[PDB]
Amino acid sequence: AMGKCPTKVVLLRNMVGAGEVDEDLEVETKEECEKYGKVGKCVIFEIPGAPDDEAVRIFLEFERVESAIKAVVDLNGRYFGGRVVKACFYNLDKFRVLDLAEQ
């Protein structure tokens, strides 16, 4: 439900497995996504005890909703490191208070 409401915040799931957050994840994510529009922030958060395909959440805050829509349309179903990425929106206010485990 929240994942279908367009905001400037994009959530990426399934980028890497649980316990597989590496140091280059932020740079690879942000530099590619800069082509949908200006990126303000890139946040990596790992939900403890979550399943392999849900555990690692990568958030991007774009400057504008139009960029975010482009990113969600292009990144959902896209491969990253052999994994099929899931892309959706995230509530801005929840993202900004670090409520990163909703939905």
Place this chain on the structure above:
Amino acid sequence: KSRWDE
């Protein structure tokens, strides 16, 4: 690797 599309 850039892992995009790989």
